[PDB]
Amino acid sequence: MKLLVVYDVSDDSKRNKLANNLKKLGLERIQRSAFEGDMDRMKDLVRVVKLIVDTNTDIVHIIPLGIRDWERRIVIGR
Amino acid sequence: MKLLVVYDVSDDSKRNKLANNLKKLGLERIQRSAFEGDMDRMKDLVRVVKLIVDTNTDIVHIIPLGIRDWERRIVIGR
Ligand SMILES: [Cl-]
Ligand SMILES: [Cl-]
Ligand code: NA
Ligand code: NA
């Protein structure tokens, strides 16, 4: 069981508070605004995201996926 | 069968060429740098992304997921 957190956070400063907190909960950065990690927590994840981002302005997707779907992703670039 | 395309494209101009092309192939924008769509195409999707982005610099994830995993996402914010 995996999950992805993908975010669109307007305030520069809120964006890296969130990045910092996602690392702390053990997720790993895969791109500038996306992290992945293993199923562990959930309720804390949502609370963290809600407390940090501007909910009228920002968008965060927290998406479950199976391990085999993540494994079969295609990654283009660096 | 769904997929997500999540991107981290440095050049402003390449980013919306990609956004424009992802809409054309029928994907739908869900956030500033993420689109979702249904399984249809695949080989064309990868070719499009590779031709548009700078592959030494940019990162794009093309991620398959089951319909029920997408349905059970949590979306925070606007
Ligand atoms: Cl990766
Ligand atoms: Cl959505
Ligand atoms: Na990104
Ligand atoms: Na985004």
Side-chain angles (χ1 to χ4, degrees):
Chain A
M1 262 324 92
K2 309 233 104 212
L3 54 65
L4 295 174
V5 180
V6 181
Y7 52 93
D8 167 357
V9 169
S10 279
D11 186 350
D12 252 20
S13 165
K14 291 193 230 270
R15 177 158 54 275
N16 40 192
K17 197 173 213 171
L18 183 64
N20 285 353
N21 279 90
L22 303 178
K23 291 174 220 283
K24 286 178 23 143
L25 306 189
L27 306 233
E28 277 181 25
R29 188 193 287 278
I30 58 170
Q31 282 193 19
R32 149 186 165 92
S33 286
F35 274 74
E36 51 86 15
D38 305 325
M39 231 58 160
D40 267 9
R41 95 94 30 126
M42 186 63 127
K43 208 55 175 322
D44 278 9
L45 179 60
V46 172
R47 230 217 342 189
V48 157
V49 169
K50 292 184 178 279
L51 291 175
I52 289 164
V53 304
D54 179 333
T55 278
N56 305 109
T57 290
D58 299 338
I59 307 151
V60 183
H61 274 75
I62 300 165
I63 298 166
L65 55 184
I67 179 57
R68 291 292 300 126
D69 302 318
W70 171 244
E71 285 183 341
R72 298 209 80 244
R73 70 189 178 281
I74 290 163
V75 191
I76 287 146
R78 214 212 336 51
Chain B
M1 262 324 92
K2 309 233 104 212
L3 54 65
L4 295 174
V5 180
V6 181
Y7 52 93
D8 167 357
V9 169
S10 279
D11 186 350
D12 252 20
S13 165
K14 291 193 230 270
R15 177 158 54 275
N16 40 192
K17 197 173 213 171
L18 183 64
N20 285 353
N21 279 90
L22 303 178
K23 291 174 220 283
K24 286 178 23 143
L25 306 189
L27 306 233
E28 277 181 25
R29 188 193 287 278
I30 58 170
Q31 282 193 19
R32 149 186 165 92
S33 286
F35 274 74
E36 51 86 15
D38 305 325
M39 231 58 160
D40 267 9
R41 95 94 30 126
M42 186 63 127
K43 208 55 175 322
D44 278 9
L45 179 60
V46 172
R47 230 217 342 189
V48 157
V49 169
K50 292 184 178 279
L51 291 175
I52 289 164
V53 304
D54 179 333
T55 278
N56 305 109
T57 290
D58 299 338
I59 307 151
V60 183
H61 274 75
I62 300 165
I63 298 166
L65 55 184
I67 179 57
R68 291 292 300 126
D69 302 318
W70 171 244
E71 285 183 341
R72 298 209 80 244
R73 70 189 178 281
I74 290 163
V75 191
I76 287 146
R78 214 212 336 51

Tab-separated table of all heavy atoms in Angstrom, chain B residues 7-57:
chain	number	residue	atom	x	y	z
B	7	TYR	N	3.921	16.680	-13.155
B	7	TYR	CA	5.172	17.214	-13.735
B	7	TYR	C	5.875	18.356	-12.922
B	7	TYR	O	5.263	19.113	-12.092
B	7	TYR	CB	4.963	17.578	-15.218
B	7	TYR	CG	3.788	18.475	-15.486
B	7	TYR	CD1	3.934	19.878	-15.533
B	7	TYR	CD2	2.521	17.950	-15.696
B	7	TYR	CE1	2.837	20.731	-15.767
B	7	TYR	CE2	1.404	18.809	-15.912
B	7	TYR	CZ	1.579	20.162	-15.960
B	7	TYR	OH	0.481	20.953	-16.197
B	8	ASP	N	7.170	18.500	-13.194
B	8	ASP	CA	8.020	19.484	-12.572
B	8	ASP	C	8.842	19.985	-13.780
B	8	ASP	O	9.879	19.421	-14.183
B	8	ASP	CB	8.813	18.761	-11.458
B	8	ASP	CG	9.990	19.581	-10.898
B	8	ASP	OD1	10.252	20.717	-11.410
B	8	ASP	OD2	10.691	19.052	-9.952
B	9	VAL	N	8.309	21.013	-14.422
B	9	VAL	CA	8.887	21.521	-15.606
B	9	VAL	C	9.402	22.932	-15.332
B	9	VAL	O	8.590	23.820	-15.110
B	9	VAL	CB	7.854	21.563	-16.735
B	9	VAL	CG1	8.402	22.334	-17.896
B	9	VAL	CG2	7.488	20.117	-17.159
B	10	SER	N	10.730	23.130	-15.334
B	10	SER	CA	11.323	24.465	-15.057
B	10	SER	C	10.934	25.596	-16.010
B	10	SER	O	10.408	26.597	-15.544
B	10	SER	CB	12.846	24.412	-14.859
B	10	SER	OG	13.097	24.001	-13.513
B	11	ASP	N	11.173	25.454	-17.311
B	11	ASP	CA	10.759	26.491	-18.297
B	11	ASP	C	9.206	26.768	-18.352
B	11	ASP	O	8.417	25.923	-18.810
B	11	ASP	CB	11.325	26.105	-19.667
B	11	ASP	CG	11.109	27.150	-20.725
B	11	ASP	OD1	10.362	28.127	-20.522
B	11	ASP	OD2	11.719	26.998	-21.803
B	12	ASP	N	8.793	27.953	-17.878
B	12	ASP	CA	7.391	28.459	-17.923
B	12	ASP	C	6.648	28.117	-19.219
B	12	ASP	O	5.478	27.735	-19.214
B	12	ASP	CB	7.362	30.004	-17.765
B	12	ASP	CG	6.825	30.481	-16.402
B	12	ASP	OD1	6.816	29.683	-15.438
B	12	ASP	OD2	6.422	31.675	-16.294
B	13	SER	N	7.338	28.281	-20.328
B	13	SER	CA	6.755	28.090	-21.620
B	13	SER	C	6.556	26.612	-21.985
B	13	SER	O	5.557	26.252	-22.602
B	13	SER	CB	7.651	28.802	-22.611
B	13	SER	OG	7.322	28.375	-23.899
B	14	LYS	N	7.507	25.763	-21.596
B	14	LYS	CA	7.373	24.328	-21.774
B	14	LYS	C	6.264	23.790	-20.905
B	14	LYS	O	5.535	22.913	-21.349
B	14	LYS	CB	8.662	23.569	-21.440
B	14	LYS	CG	9.814	23.784	-22.412
B	14	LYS	CD	10.887	22.750	-22.143
B	14	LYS	CE	12.277	23.368	-22.012
B	14	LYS	NZ	13.004	23.456	-23.302
B	15	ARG	N	6.131	24.307	-19.684
B	15	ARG	CA	5.045	23.867	-18.809
B	15	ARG	C	3.653	24.034	-19.438
B	15	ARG	O	2.822	23.145	-19.363
B	15	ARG	CB	5.066	24.500	-17.404
B	15	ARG	CG	3.862	24.077	-16.478
B	15	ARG	CD	4.097	24.237	-14.958
B	15	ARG	NE	4.494	25.616	-14.765
B	15	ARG	CZ	5.756	26.044	-14.889
B	15	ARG	NH1	6.709	25.160	-15.142
B	15	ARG	NH2	6.081	27.331	-14.751
B	16	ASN	N	3.354	25.146	-20.086
B	16	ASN	CA	2.006	25.171	-20.618
B	16	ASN	C	1.813	24.597	-21.997
B	16	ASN	O	0.689	24.236	-22.317
B	16	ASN	CB	1.380	26.529	-20.519
B	16	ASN	CG	2.315	27.588	-20.834
B	16	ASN	OD1	2.025	28.753	-20.581
B	16	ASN	ND2	3.472	27.222	-21.394
B	17	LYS	N	2.877	24.480	-22.800
B	17	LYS	CA	2.819	23.569	-23.939
B	17	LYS	C	2.384	22.172	-23.484
B	17	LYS	O	1.504	21.563	-24.091
B	17	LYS	CB	4.164	23.463	-24.575
B	17	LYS	CG	4.129	22.885	-25.983
B	17	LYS	CD	5.534	22.954	-26.661
B	17	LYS	CE	5.432	23.160	-28.125
B	17	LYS	NZ	6.764	23.433	-28.717
B	18	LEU	N	2.996	21.667	-22.414
B	18	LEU	CA	2.657	20.317	-21.875
B	18	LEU	C	1.218	20.262	-21.379
B	18	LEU	O	0.486	19.400	-21.798
B	18	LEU	CB	3.625	19.904	-20.759
B	18	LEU	CG	3.401	18.503	-20.186
B	18	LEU	CD1	3.649	17.449	-21.232
B	18	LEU	CD2	4.321	18.297	-18.991
B	19	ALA	N	0.808	21.242	-20.563
B	19	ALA	CA	-0.584	21.349	-20.070
B	19	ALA	C	-1.525	21.343	-21.255
B	19	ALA	O	-2.511	20.615	-21.248
B	19	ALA	CB	-0.802	22.592	-19.229
B	20	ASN	N	-1.192	22.111	-22.289
B	20	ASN	CA	-2.049	22.204	-23.489
B	20	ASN	C	-2.175	20.883	-24.187
B	20	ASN	O	-3.270	20.516	-24.629
B	20	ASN	CB	-1.517	23.218	-24.528
B	20	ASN	CG	-1.742	24.658	-24.115
B	20	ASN	OD1	-2.416	24.940	-23.095
B	20	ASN	ND2	-1.136	25.583	-24.855
B	21	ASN	N	-1.042	20.192	-24.320
B	21	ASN	CA	-1.047	18.875	-24.963
B	21	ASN	C	-1.693	17.735	-24.203
B	21	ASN	O	-2.385	16.895	-24.781
B	21	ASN	CB	0.331	18.515	-25.421
B	21	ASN	CG	0.647	19.174	-26.754
B	21	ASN	OD1	1.174	20.312	-26.801
B	21	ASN	ND2	0.232	18.503	-27.850
B	22	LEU	N	-1.472	17.710	-22.909
B	22	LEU	CA	-2.243	16.813	-22.029
B	22	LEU	C	-3.791	17.033	-22.153
B	22	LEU	O	-4.517	16.061	-22.195
B	22	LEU	CB	-1.730	16.927	-20.558
B	22	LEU	CG	-0.250	16.662	-20.254
B	22	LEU	CD1	0.030	16.876	-18.756
B	22	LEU	CD2	0.079	15.246	-20.656
B	23	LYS	N	-4.294	18.276	-22.217
B	23	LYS	CA	-5.735	18.466	-22.425
B	23	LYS	C	-6.101	17.848	-23.783
B	23	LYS	O	-7.083	17.113	-23.890
B	23	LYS	CB	-6.161	19.942	-22.444
B	23	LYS	CG	-6.056	20.632	-21.114
B	23	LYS	CD	-6.379	22.146	-21.306
B	23	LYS	CE	-5.457	23.129	-20.450
B	23	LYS	NZ	-5.749	23.295	-18.956
B	24	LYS	N	-5.294	18.118	-24.818
B	24	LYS	CA	-5.630	17.652	-26.164
B	24	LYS	C	-5.798	16.146	-26.212
B	24	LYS	O	-6.678	15.662	-26.922
B	24	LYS	CB	-4.600	18.094	-27.213
B	24	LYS	CG	-4.652	19.578	-27.615
B	24	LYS	CD	-3.533	19.937	-28.653
B	24	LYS	CE	-3.038	18.707	-29.446
B	24	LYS	NZ	-2.722	19.026	-30.894
B	25	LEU	N	-4.973	15.413	-25.462
B	25	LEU	CA	-5.068	13.946	-25.438
B	25	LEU	C	-6.235	13.484	-24.565
B	25	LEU	O	-6.293	12.281	-24.204
B	25	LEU	CB	-3.771	13.291	-24.901
B	25	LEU	CG	-2.392	13.598	-25.492
B	25	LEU	CD1	-1.380	12.671	-24.925
B	25	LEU	CD2	-2.400	13.454	-26.966
B	26	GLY	N	-7.078	14.440	-24.128
B	26	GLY	CA	-8.192	14.179	-23.182
B	26	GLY	C	-7.938	14.047	-21.665
B	26	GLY	O	-8.850	13.677	-20.903
B	27	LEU	N	-6.746	14.344	-21.167
B	27	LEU	CA	-6.592	14.340	-19.692
B	27	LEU	C	-7.188	15.612	-19.114
B	27	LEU	O	-7.300	16.588	-19.821
B	27	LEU	CB	-5.146	14.317	-19.271
B	27	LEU	CG	-4.188	13.277	-19.778
B	27	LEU	CD1	-3.543	12.642	-18.585
B	27	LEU	CD2	-4.898	12.243	-20.443
B	28	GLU	N	-7.507	15.619	-17.821
B	28	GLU	CA	-8.130	16.755	-17.186
B	28	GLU	C	-7.260	17.309	-16.106
B	28	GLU	O	-6.732	16.542	-15.288
B	28	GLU	CB	-9.494	16.346	-16.628
B	28	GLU	CG	-10.545	16.415	-17.767
B	28	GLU	CD	-11.928	16.053	-17.305
B	28	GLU	OE1	-12.235	16.210	-16.081
B	28	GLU	OE2	-12.721	15.610	-18.168
B	29	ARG	N	-7.145	18.639	-16.054
B	29	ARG	CA	-6.315	19.214	-15.018
B	29	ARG	C	-6.929	19.018	-13.647
B	29	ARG	O	-8.091	19.231	-13.479
B	29	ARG	CB	-6.050	20.669	-15.255
B	29	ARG	CG	-5.037	21.172	-14.261
B	29	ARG	CD	-4.987	22.711	-14.265
B	29	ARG	NE	-4.339	23.265	-15.455
B	29	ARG	CZ	-3.023	23.408	-15.659
B	29	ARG	NH1	-2.155	23.029	-14.743
B	29	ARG	NH2	-2.582	23.973	-16.780
B	30	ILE	N	-6.164	18.534	-12.683
B	30	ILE	CA	-6.637	18.479	-11.297
B	30	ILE	C	-5.859	19.460	-10.405
B	30	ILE	O	-6.345	19.776	-9.338
B	30	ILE	CB	-6.514	17.069	-10.673
B	30	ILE	CG1	-5.091	16.623	-10.714
B	30	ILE	CG2	-7.358	16.103	-11.411
B	30	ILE	CD1	-4.741	15.271	-9.873
B	31	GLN	N	-4.648	19.894	-10.791
B	31	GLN	CA	-3.878	20.890	-9.998
B	31	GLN	C	-2.965	21.564	-10.923
B	31	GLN	O	-2.809	21.116	-12.033
B	31	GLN	CB	-2.857	20.204	-9.118
B	31	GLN	CG	-3.355	19.633	-7.964
B	31	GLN	CD	-2.276	19.252	-7.011
B	31	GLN	OE1	-1.131	19.740	-7.090
B	31	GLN	NE2	-2.670	18.481	-5.989
B	32	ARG	N	-2.230	22.542	-10.427
B	32	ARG	CA	-1.285	23.265	-11.272
B	32	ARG	C	-0.300	22.379	-12.081
B	32	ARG	O	0.112	22.721	-13.211
B	32	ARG	CB	-0.513	24.292	-10.451
B	32	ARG	CG	0.851	24.539	-10.937
B	32	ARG	CD	1.615	25.448	-10.001
B	32	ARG	NE	3.015	25.341	-10.370
B	32	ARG	CZ	3.611	26.145	-11.234
B	32	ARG	NH1	2.934	27.132	-11.797
B	32	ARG	NH2	4.884	25.962	-11.535
B	33	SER	N	0.134	21.265	-11.527
B	33	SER	CA	1.064	20.479	-12.375
B	33	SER	C	0.683	18.994	-12.386
B	33	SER	O	1.546	18.149	-12.255
B	33	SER	CB	2.517	20.716	-11.921
B	33	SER	OG	2.966	22.013	-12.324
B	34	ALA	N	-0.614	18.695	-12.507
B	34	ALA	CA	-1.065	17.311	-12.417
B	34	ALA	C	-2.333	17.198	-13.225
B	34	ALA	O	-3.151	18.095	-13.242
B	34	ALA	CB	-1.289	16.924	-10.948
B	35	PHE	N	-2.462	16.106	-13.933
B	35	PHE	CA	-3.626	15.833	-14.762
B	35	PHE	C	-4.030	14.387	-14.490
B	35	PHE	O	-3.168	13.595	-14.057
B	35	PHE	CB	-3.230	15.925	-16.243
B	35	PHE	CG	-3.288	17.308	-16.804
B	35	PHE	CD1	-2.309	18.254	-16.461
B	35	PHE	CD2	-4.313	17.664	-17.661
B	35	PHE	CE1	-2.331	19.569	-16.935
B	35	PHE	CE2	-4.363	18.988	-18.198
B	35	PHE	CZ	-3.347	19.951	-17.811
B	36	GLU	N	-5.290	14.038	-14.720
B	36	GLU	CA	-5.719	12.614	-14.667
B	36	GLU	C	-6.563	12.305	-15.878
B	36	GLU	O	-7.122	13.228	-16.496
B	36	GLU	CB	-6.497	12.262	-13.357
B	36	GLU	CG	-7.674	13.240	-13.057
B	36	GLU	CD	-9.013	12.885	-13.752
B	36	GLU	OE1	-9.108	11.713	-14.237
B	36	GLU	OE2	-9.958	13.763	-13.779
B	37	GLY	N	-6.667	11.033	-16.254
B	37	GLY	CA	-7.466	10.721	-17.411
B	37	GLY	C	-7.639	9.234	-17.413
B	37	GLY	O	-7.101	8.573	-16.549
B	38	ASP	N	-8.390	8.722	-18.368
B	38	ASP	CA	-8.629	7.325	-18.466
B	38	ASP	C	-7.695	6.730	-19.502
B	38	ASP	O	-7.457	7.322	-20.558
B	38	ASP	CB	-10.083	7.053	-18.887
B	38	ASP	CG	-11.160	7.734	-17.952
B	38	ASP	OD1	-10.999	7.871	-16.707
B	38	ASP	OD2	-12.235	8.107	-18.506
B	39	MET	N	-7.153	5.564	-19.163
B	39	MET	CA	-6.673	4.514	-20.114
B	39	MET	C	-7.407	4.287	-21.490
B	39	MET	O	-8.587	3.870	-21.547
B	39	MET	CB	-6.719	3.173	-19.359
B	39	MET	CG	-5.418	2.364	-19.409
B	39	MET	SD	-3.880	3.399	-18.665
B	39	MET	CE	-2.627	1.839	-18.260
B	40	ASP	N	-6.674	4.464	-22.585
B	40	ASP	CA	-7.300	4.613	-23.922
B	40	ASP	C	-6.891	3.637	-25.058
B	40	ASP	O	-7.000	3.957	-26.272
B	40	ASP	CB	-7.035	6.041	-24.394
B	40	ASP	CG	-8.143	6.990	-24.048
B	40	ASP	OD1	-9.087	6.604	-23.281
B	40	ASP	OD2	-8.038	8.124	-24.586
B	41	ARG	N	-2.772	5.115	-27.264
B	41	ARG	CA	-2.673	6.282	-26.380
B	41	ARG	C	-1.375	6.292	-25.550
B	41	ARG	O	-0.628	7.256	-25.599
B	41	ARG	CB	-3.931	6.452	-25.497
B	41	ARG	CG	-3.907	5.847	-24.073
B	41	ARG	CD	-3.465	6.892	-23.005
B	41	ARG	NE	-3.868	8.223	-23.447
B	41	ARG	CZ	-4.588	9.052	-22.724
B	41	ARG	NH1	-4.924	8.666	-21.518
B	41	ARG	NH2	-4.970	10.236	-23.214
B	42	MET	N	-1.087	5.227	-24.806
B	42	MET	CA	0.048	5.256	-23.862
B	42	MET	C	1.318	5.705	-24.564
B	42	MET	O	1.956	6.657	-24.132
B	42	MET	CB	0.273	3.910	-23.150
B	42	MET	CG	1.348	3.955	-22.048
B	42	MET	SD	0.896	5.223	-20.480
B	42	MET	CE	1.113	3.951	-18.867
B	43	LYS	N	1.649	5.038	-25.669
B	43	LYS	CA	2.887	5.283	-26.396
B	43	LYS	C	2.966	6.729	-26.887
B	43	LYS	O	4.048	7.333	-26.867
B	43	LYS	CB	3.011	4.289	-27.542
B	43	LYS	CG	4.449	3.986	-27.938
B	43	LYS	CD	5.366	3.486	-26.766
B	43	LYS	CE	6.757	3.085	-27.337
B	43	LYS	NZ	6.597	2.396	-28.702
B	44	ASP	N	1.811	7.280	-27.278
B	44	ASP	CA	1.707	8.685	-27.660
B	44	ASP	C	1.886	9.664	-26.535
B	44	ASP	O	2.521	10.701	-26.738
B	44	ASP	CB	0.406	8.977	-28.371
B	44	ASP	CG	0.486	8.620	-29.811
B	44	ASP	OD1	1.499	7.983	-30.213
B	44	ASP	OD2	-0.439	8.977	-30.560
B	45	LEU	N	1.309	9.334	-25.370
B	45	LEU	CA	1.506	10.082	-24.138
B	45	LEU	C	3.002	10.235	-23.795
B	45	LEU	O	3.493	11.344	-23.589
B	45	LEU	CB	0.734	9.460	-22.961
B	45	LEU	CG	0.895	10.168	-21.632
B	45	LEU	CD1	0.394	11.557	-21.807
B	45	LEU	CD2	0.079	9.461	-20.551
B	46	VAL	N	3.726	9.132	-23.757
B	46	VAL	CA	5.124	9.192	-23.435
B	46	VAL	C	5.885	10.004	-24.472
B	46	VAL	O	6.713	10.841	-24.092
B	46	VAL	CB	5.699	7.774	-23.254
B	46	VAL	CG1	7.204	7.784	-23.113
B	46	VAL	CG2	5.054	7.100	-22.025
B	47	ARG	N	5.599	9.797	-25.761
B	47	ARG	CA	6.289	10.541	-26.824
B	47	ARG	C	6.006	12.037	-26.639
B	47	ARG	O	6.911	12.853	-26.628
B	47	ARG	CB	5.886	10.036	-28.213
B	47	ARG	CG	7.072	9.714	-29.176
B	47	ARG	CD	6.783	10.104	-30.662
B	47	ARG	NE	5.344	10.309	-31.039
B	47	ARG	CZ	4.888	10.488	-32.305
B	47	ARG	NH1	5.732	10.496	-33.368
B	47	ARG	NH2	3.584	10.660	-32.517
B	48	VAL	N	4.767	12.422	-26.413
B	48	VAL	CA	4.466	13.834	-26.184
B	48	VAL	C	5.252	14.446	-25.044
B	48	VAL	O	5.853	15.518	-25.182
B	48	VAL	CB	2.974	14.015	-25.880
B	48	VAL	CG1	2.662	15.341	-25.083
B	48	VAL	CG2	2.157	13.849	-27.149
B	49	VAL	N	5.239	13.787	-23.892
B	49	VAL	CA	5.936	14.323	-22.771
B	49	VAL	C	7.409	14.453	-23.106
B	49	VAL	O	7.984	15.496	-22.915
B	49	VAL	CB	5.713	13.426	-21.536
B	49	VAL	CG1	6.655	13.849	-20.431
B	49	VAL	CG2	4.252	13.499	-21.072
B	50	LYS	N	8.028	13.397	-23.628
B	50	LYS	CA	9.488	13.456	-23.935
B	50	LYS	C	9.887	14.597	-24.916
B	50	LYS	O	10.968	15.219	-24.782
B	50	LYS	CB	10.020	12.125	-24.490
B	50	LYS	CG	10.050	10.927	-23.523
B	50	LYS	CD	10.709	9.702	-24.224
B	50	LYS	CE	10.781	8.530	-23.238
B	50	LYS	NZ	11.955	8.589	-22.260
B	51	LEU	N	9.020	14.868	-25.889
B	51	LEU	CA	9.341	15.846	-26.928
B	51	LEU	C	9.241	17.241	-26.338
B	51	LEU	O	9.988	18.130	-26.741
B	51	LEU	CB	8.421	15.673	-28.120
B	51	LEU	CG	8.558	14.403	-28.991
B	51	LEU	CD1	7.505	14.254	-30.090
B	51	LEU	CD2	9.904	14.309	-29.675
B	52	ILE	N	8.378	17.432	-25.344
B	52	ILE	CA	8.135	18.777	-24.828
B	52	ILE	C	9.084	19.157	-23.692
B	52	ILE	O	9.558	20.275	-23.626
B	52	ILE	CB	6.650	18.962	-24.326
B	52	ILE	CG1	5.690	18.986	-25.523
B	52	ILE	CG2	6.496	20.308	-23.502
B	52	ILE	CD1	4.233	18.766	-25.101
B	53	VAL	N	9.291	18.257	-22.738
B	53	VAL	CA	10.031	18.671	-21.571
B	53	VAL	C	11.531	18.552	-21.853
B	53	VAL	O	11.934	17.793	-22.764
B	53	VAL	CB	9.656	17.820	-20.329
B	53	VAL	CG1	8.111	17.894	-20.106
B	53	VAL	CG2	10.201	16.384	-20.457
B	54	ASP	N	12.341	19.284	-21.067
B	54	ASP	CA	13.813	19.105	-21.038
B	54	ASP	C	14.110	17.920	-20.153
B	54	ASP	O	14.017	17.990	-18.969
B	54	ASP	CB	14.487	20.357	-20.480
B	54	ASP	CG	16.022	20.243	-20.391
B	54	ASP	OD1	16.632	19.123	-20.247
B	54	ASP	OD2	16.617	21.345	-20.417
B	55	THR	N	14.497	16.830	-20.763
B	55	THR	CA	14.833	15.588	-20.075
B	55	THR	C	16.074	15.556	-19.155
B	55	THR	O	16.252	14.611	-18.352
B	55	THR	CB	14.925	14.571	-21.155
B	55	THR	OG1	13.576	14.171	-21.406
B	55	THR	CG2	15.850	13.355	-20.821
B	56	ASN	N	16.910	16.592	-19.213
B	56	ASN	CA	18.025	16.636	-18.284
B	56	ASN	C	17.686	17.340	-17.027
B	56	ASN	O	18.431	17.219	-16.081
B	56	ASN	CB	19.214	17.327	-18.917
B	56	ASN	CG	19.590	16.678	-20.203
B	56	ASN	OD1	19.385	17.263	-21.276
B	56	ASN	ND2	20.041	15.402	-20.127
B	57	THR	N	16.561	18.052	-17.038
B	57	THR	CA	16.178	19.104	-16.087
B	57	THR	C	14.835	18.838	-15.470
B	57	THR	O	14.639	19.178	-14.323
B	57	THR	CB	15.979	20.449	-16.864
B	57	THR	OG1	17.249	20.904	-17.303
B	57	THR	CG2	15.202	21.580	-16.076
